[PDB]
């Protein structure tokens, strides 16, 4: 019974390590994406909250009745 499939990786499918490309660990859905793939940076990763683009859209209302 499929409720939530546990596939979590950055949408480019290259790496996930701040050595090469900075990465945000989207706490809201345990999704490991890149900062420079979600329009974010590692400098404020130290400070501010960080998510994958789908969680932004999901917090926003959907066009339906």
Query: Look-up: residue for tokens 């019974």?
Result: 1
Residue 55 in contact with Zn ion, rule: CB under 5 A: yes
Tell whether residue 52 is a contact of Zn ion (CB under 5 A): yes
Q: Please report whether residue 34 would count as binding Zn ion according to CB under 5 A.
A: yes
DSSP per residue, 19-31: TTB-EEEETTTTE
Q: Is 24 in the site for Zn ion (CB under 5 A)?
A: no
Give the one residue of 37, 38, 40, 50 binding Zn ion; rule: CB under 5 A.
37
- The residue (of 40 and 52) whose beta carbon lies closer to Zn ion is 52
- Give yes or no for a contact between 10 and 37, defined as CB atoms under 8 angstroms apart: yes
62/17 Cα distance (integer angstroms) = 33
What is the smallest separation between the CB atom of 65 and Zn ion, expressed in angstroms? 26
């Amino acid at each position: 019974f499929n409720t939530s499939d546990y596939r979590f990786e950055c949408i480019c499918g290259e790496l996930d390590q701040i050595d090469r490309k900075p990465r945000v660990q989207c706490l809201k859905c345990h999704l490991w994406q890149h900062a420079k793939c979600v329009n974010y940076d590692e400098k404020n990763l130290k400070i501010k909250p960080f998510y994958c683009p789908h969680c932004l859209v999901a917090m926003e209302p959907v066009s339906t009745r």
